[PDB]
C-alpha cells in the first residue's frame, strides 16, 4: 500500500457551430477525414480564443455604402429580366463580387487530370467555394503523415537496368515460421552485407569480398601475391527476385506520388526503403512478408497506467512497474490484442484482430479484402453482438445483422 500510494504521487453540449460552418457549404462526397479533423482543431482554437463561429456573423463595410444580404437576394433575383447580351455581368461584376470578378480564362474544369490525382478533381467540383479551400486543407493535413518523410529523405539503358537489378538484389522484410515479423537484427558484422548491393555501390561490395576472403585466410591460418578477384556467382547470389516482367513505368508528380503512396500503404503492411547512391534516389517496396502457410501474426499487450486501487494495483500494475498514472477511479486499463493476416493465393486479404479488455469486453474483428472491397464482421463477447458491415471500392457502406438493427443477441 505504501508503494501504491507513492506510485500515485509520481452540460455535455459541445460547441459545434464552428465545425458545422466549415463543412455545411461542402458536399459530403468530398468531406474527407482530414477535412473533418482540421475543423475539429479550428473549433478548439476558436473556443479557447473565443473566436465566434464564422457563419452567424455580418462583416466588412462599404465604399459605396450599405449592409450585407439583399443582393444575395438580387444576385439571385437578377437573372430573370428584360433583354440583350451586355449588362448582366457588368451588373454581375458590379453586382457579383469584384473578388469573384476574377474570372480566369476558363481553366477551371476543362483540364487533364491524372488517373491518381483525386485532389485536382475535388478542386474543380469545389471551384466555386469561397474563403475556404478544402483541397489545400486536405493536402496540409496529409503532409503530417509519416509517408511524407519518404518524399523528403535526407541527402549526404544501363542506369535503368542497374535500378531494376538493385530491386532484385534487395532483401525485404521476412517473417518467421510462426508469422511474427523478423526484427531487423542490429548485429555489427551481418549488417554490412545488406547495404552492399553490387548493382548500386560495387566499391562496398568489392570490400565485402575482400573482408570475406581475409577472414577465410584467418580461419585457415590458425594452427604468391593474393589477387582478390570477384566472380559472376558473387554477383548472382545477391539476386533475390526477378523483375523481367516489369517493363511498364508510370511517372508521378510530388503531389500525385503522395496519393499513390497512401493508397499502397492501406494495401501493404511492410514498407522497405533503400537509398540508391548513384542518383540519390530512394527505393521503396510495398510488400507483405509471409510464411509457408501464408500467415502474418502480430501480438501486442499494453497496460495503460492508472490510479488503480489497492486491489487493481497489485494484480496488473504491480508487476509492470517492478512511471506516470492517469485518473480512472480504480479501473485498470490493460489492453491485449492479437492480429492475424491471411493472404490466399487469389490476391485477397483476411485481417483478423482480437482485442480483449482485462476488465471489460472482448472484441473480435474479421476483415476480408478482395477486389478493393472490404467485408467486415464485428463480434463482442464470443456471441452477444453480431453484425456484418461492408465498404465497397466506390465508398458505399453496408450494414446488416441477424439480431436486428441493434445487433444484440
Amino acid at each position: 500500500k505504501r508503494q501504491h500510494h507513492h506510485y500515485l504521487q509520481s452540460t455535455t453540449e459541445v460547441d459545434m457551430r464552428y465545425y458545422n460552418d466549415l463543412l455545411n457549404p461542402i458536399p459530403e462526397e468530398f468531406i474527407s477525414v482530414s477535412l473533418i479533423l482540421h475543423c475539429m482543431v479550428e473549433q478548439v482554437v476558436a473556443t479557447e480564443e473565443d473566436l465566434i463561429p464564422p457563419s452567424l456573423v455580418e462583416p466588412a463595410p462599404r465604399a459605396d455604402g450599405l449592409d450585407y444580404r439583399i443582393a444575395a437576394h438580387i444576385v439571385s433575383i437578377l437573372p430573370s429580366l428584360c433583354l440583350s447580351e451586355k449588362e448582366k455581368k457588368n451588373l454581375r461584376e458590379i453586382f457579383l463580387t469584384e473578388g469573384e470578378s476574377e474570372s480566369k480564362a476558363l481553366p477551371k474544369g476543362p483540364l487533364l487530370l491524372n488517373y491518381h490525382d483525386a485532389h485536382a478533381h475535388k478542386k474543380y467540383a469545389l471551384k466555386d467555394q469561397k474563403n475556404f479551400d478544402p483541397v489545400q486543407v486536405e493536402q496540409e493535413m496529409q503532409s503530417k503523415l509519416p509517408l511524407w518523410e519518404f518524399l523528403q529523405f535526407p541527402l549526404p539503358e544501363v542506369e535503368r537496368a542497374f535500378k531494376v537489378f538493385t530491386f532484385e538484389s534487395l532483401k525485404l522484410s521476412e517473417v518467421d515460421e510462426e508469422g511474427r515479423l523478423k526484427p531487423t537484427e542490429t548485429t555489427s558484422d551481418t549488417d554490412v552485407e545488406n547495404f552492399n548491393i553490387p548493382w548500386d555501390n560495387p566499391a562496398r561490395f568489392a570490400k565485402l569480398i575482400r573482408q570475406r576472403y581475409i577472414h577465410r585466410m584467418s580461419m585457415q591460418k590458425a594452427p604468391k601475391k593474393m589477387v582478390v578477384e570477384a566472380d559472376i556467382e558473387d554477383i548472382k547470389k545477391t539476386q533475390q527476385r526477378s523483375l523481367m516482367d516489369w517493363s511498364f513505368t508510370e511517372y508521378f508528380q510530388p503531389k500525385v506520388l503522395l496519393q499513390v503512396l497512401q493508397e499502397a500503404h492501406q494495401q501493404y503492411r511492410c514498407v522497405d526503403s533503400y537509398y540508391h547512391t548513384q542518383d540519390n534516389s530512394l527505393l521503396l517496396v510495398f510488400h507483405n512478408p509471409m510464411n509457408l502457410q501464408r500467415l502474418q501474426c502480430e501480438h501486442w499487450n499494453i497496460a495503460l497506467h492508472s490510479n488503480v486501487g489497492f486491489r487493481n494495483y497489485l494484480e496488473l500494475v504491480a508487476k509492470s512497474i517492478e512511471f506516470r498514472g492517469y485518473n480512472m477511479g480504480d479501473i485498470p486499463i490493460q489492453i491485449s490484442g492479437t492480429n492475424y493476416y491471411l493472404y490466399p493465393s487469389d490476391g485477397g486479404q483476411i485481417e483478423v484482430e482480437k482485442t480483449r479488455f482485462e476488465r471489460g469486453s472482448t472484441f473480435i474483428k474479421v476483415k476480408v479484402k478482395k477486389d478493393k472491397h472490404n467485408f467486415i464482421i464485428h463480434l463482442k463477447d464470443p456471441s452477444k453482438f453480431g453484425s456484418f458491415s461492408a465498404t465497397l471500392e466506390n465508398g458505399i457502406c453496408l450494414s446488416i445483422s441477424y439480431y436486428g438493427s441493434n445487433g444484440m443477441a
Partner: protein
C-alpha cells in the same frame, strides 16, 4: 464616418442571435433586441425586422468574425437613418458618405479606422450594395420619409 463596432448590438445580443439557429426564433430575438413592435401592427417595423433577419441569414451563409457582425449591423442602421433622414432624393450623398465610412474600417490607421476586414469581402459588398438598395431606394423612401 466612425467605427461602428458594438454600437447597436453588443457581444451578448450577438451571442443570443447565434444560439438562435432557426430563422423564426432569430427573427423573434432581433425584434426583441431592436425594440421593434409586433410586425402585424406596423409595416415599417416588419420591413426593418425582415431586412435585419435576412441580413443575418446570408451573413451566416458566408462566415466571418463577431466584431464584423456588430460593425455591419450598426453601419446598416446608420445608413438607413441617413437615407430616411430627409425626404429629398439623396442617393449619391449617402453613397459618398458611406464610401468615406468604409475607409474607417477597411484600412488600418487608428483611431479613425481599424483593419478588421479583407479586400475580397469589401468588394463583395460593393457588389451586393450597389446591386440592391439604391435600386430599391424609392421603396424605403416612400415608407420612411414624410
Amino acid at each position: 464616418p466612425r467605427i461602428c463596432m458594438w454600437k447597436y448590438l453588443d457581444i451578448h445580443s450577438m451571442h443570443r442571435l447565434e444560439k438562435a439557429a432557426t430563422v423564426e426564433k432569430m427573427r423573434e430575438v432581433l425584434a426583441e433586441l431592436l425594440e421593434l413592435g409586433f410586425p402585424e401592427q406596423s409595416l415599417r417595423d416588419a420591413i426593418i425586422l425582415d431586412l435585419f433577419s435576412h441580413a443575418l441569414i446570408f451573413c451566416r451563409q458566408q462566415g466571418f468574425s463577431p466584431e464584423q457582425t456588430s460593425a455591419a449591423c450598426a453601419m446598416l442602421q446608420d445608413l438607413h437613418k441617413a437615407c430616411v433622414a430627409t425626404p429629398l432624393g439623396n442617393v449619391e450623398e449617402c453613397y459618398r458618405y458611406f464610401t468615406s465610412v468604409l475607409f474607417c474600417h477597411g484600412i488600418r490607421r487608428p483611431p479613425f479606422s481599424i483593419d478588421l476586414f479583407k479586400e475580397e469581402q469589401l468588394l463583395a459588398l460593393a457588389d451586393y450594395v450597389v446591386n440592391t438598395y439604391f435600386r430599391h431606394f424609392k421603396l424605403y423612401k416612400y415608407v420612411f420619409t414624410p
